[PDB]
Write a protein that binds this ligand. Sequence first.
Ligand code: HEM
Ligand code: HEM
Ligand code: HEM
Ligand code: HEM
Lengths: 146, 146, 141, 141
Amino acid sequence: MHLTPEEKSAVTALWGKVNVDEVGGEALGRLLVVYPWTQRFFESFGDLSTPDAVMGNPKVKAHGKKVLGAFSDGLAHLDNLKGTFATLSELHCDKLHVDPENFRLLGNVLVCVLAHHFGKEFTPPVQAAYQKVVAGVANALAHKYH
Amino acid sequence: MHLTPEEKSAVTALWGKVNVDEVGGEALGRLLVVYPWTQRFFESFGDLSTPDAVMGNPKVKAHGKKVLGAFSDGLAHLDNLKGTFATLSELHCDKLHVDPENFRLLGNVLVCVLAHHFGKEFTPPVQAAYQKVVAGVANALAHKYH
Amino acid sequence: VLSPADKTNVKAAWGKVGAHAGEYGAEALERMFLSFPTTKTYFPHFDLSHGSAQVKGHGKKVADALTNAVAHVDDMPNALSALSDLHAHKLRVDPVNFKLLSHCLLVTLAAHLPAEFTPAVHASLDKFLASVSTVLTSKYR
Amino acid sequence: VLSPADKTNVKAAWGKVGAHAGEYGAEALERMFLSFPTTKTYFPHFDLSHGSAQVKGHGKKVADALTNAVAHVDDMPNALSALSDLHAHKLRVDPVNFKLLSHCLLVTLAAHLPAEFTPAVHASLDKFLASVSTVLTSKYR
Ligand code: HEM
Ligand code: HEM
Ligand code: HEM
Ligand code: HEM
């Protein structure tokens, strides 16, 4: 994780204006819509057959919240993502059986959601900084796979 | 490198039986044949129009020998790939402008050449350790890109 | 494989881009270069500084090809033939890079079309760029 | 795009696999699980231990599918319809995994076909496995 002092600030400043709840449900919902195979893990959420169905599912909204909540906490520890996410990493592998590629997909969808929301303030340099962050997080979460 | 002690020795042991001369040329020639876009960096090597023209091109052979000689040296330092390849990383980025994805392609071609060359001796576990090594080398070579 | 719905979505979003195509084109290149530095290995002969005319020019060419591709959504292969030739035989850009640029175009589009960038359109666009990408690397080997 | 020469190369190579197809498919899987451990997340219900009965069985299945693919190289979409469906709507294996198995299939072949595994045949097989992968993920979205 190499975040220049500036990138760090940019990440922090934007994150302070983010409504995790709202953003989480939107990122998780879009994931499910753009890359439908990711629905394989959420059979129990119900019908995810239409974008409207997905976007309005409360189980999708709650999960998006849980996930981005954890994401949010990692932003507090960019210096030790690995240690911070170690337990969740082992959980995703041994218990959930989640292909770590999903973490990369969610990271790119997240960036799309921040751009959508923030418009012009989501400048090239801000995106580059977030790009480093989502990669760092996906990597931390894939770290304990075996 | 993140190789078990068992893995480290399996790698070393097999490598001792490798003819770097012969193998470098086969591996670089096969890269040029299977993934033809990679020819973009060798316009100065002459004719690479056919499999045959590629495989028998002496510049191809001489270059493969150079590449694999440098690869061999890194094997003596599985612990500091980053260190051993720093200079080569800067060169490849700053002077050659090589997209690092190519390092990954070459690593998979090499694995195929070792398998072809050693047959049954290139067991699943030996390939696994070699997969770890080629990934490690591509990352170390990608390290100084900017 | 683009459904009728997808094509509809694309024609619609690209429609709103309109005259701004070229500007978005250059913006996406910029985002790519900064987000994925390895892509710069393909433009060693370019001034990659902010607002370089080269990037500006390049971004326009790229948007122009995309416009042409939306116009001919039903026959991209022939509509982009000379471009797939150039990429396969001359440029020889490793196929992973196409995915990088496609992501950066989506980012650009989202930052400029808040109203238009719904999940369904996002999905259509992702698929469309993936298709353009397949056409462009269709003659690699 | 498989040329006439690609098709000949594949049939020749696969002709040589002949009766060992199932044994090679099991070996390719084992090679995949060991080298790319993330691929194991799709087989939480399998005993992945060396020589496991589930692995052997599955390896035979994969091999037979490839054999069929070779037999219908000119009609893959139709030949593999049941599998495209299955992967797209049930299994839902991320598309990157296909590239991992393909590589392990190539390695297996290489370790077993010393005479046949020439650079030209190697290129033909890589191209063939990419085509099979494309068919199997063609209905994902
Ligand atoms: C930023 C990346 C991610 C983070 C930080 C994250 C975090 C979490 C957390 C905090 C939980 C709750 C675990 C517990 O009970 O302690 C969880 C559960 C789960 N996550 Fe992840 N997650 C991420 C990405 C994903 C993705 C992309 C998927 C699938 C596409 C996924 C699939 C699941 C599933 C299926 C569960 C269990 C849900 C349940 O039991 O209700 N996660 N995740
Ligand atoms: C294992 C990965 C690789 C290693 C260890 C390696 C190593 C080297 C070395 C030692 C040199 C010569 C340095 C000098 O001039 O002192 C070199 C040059 C070069 N390499 Fe790499 N290389 C690798 C992969 C690649 C790949 C995959 C490509 C392109 C597909 C590539 C393209 C080049 C080019 C174009 C040159 C310059 C040749 C010339 O002097 O004309 N390398 N490499
Ligand atoms: C959506 C995908 C793409 C489209 C529609 C596209 C379109 C084009 C067009 C229209 C040209 C100029 C043709 C001419 O002036 O003769 C071009 C050239 C070029 N493209 Fe692509 N391209 C795409 C993807 C990429 C990617 C991903 C890269 C690598 C990062 C790339 C690298 C290049 C380069 C280096 C040139 C030559 C620029 C110059 O020297 O003027 N392209 N492309
Ligand atoms: C060359 C590409 C592939 C071919 C030809 C292929 C073929 C097959 C076949 C023939 C079956 C059995 C259908 C049945 O049960 O009747 C199957 C099932 C399955 N495949 Fe694919 N497959 C491919 C790639 C993959 C990949 C890359 C993965 C995951 C890493 C995967 C995961 C699975 C799983 C999990 C099942 C169900 C296994 C079970 O529970 O029995 N496949 N595949």
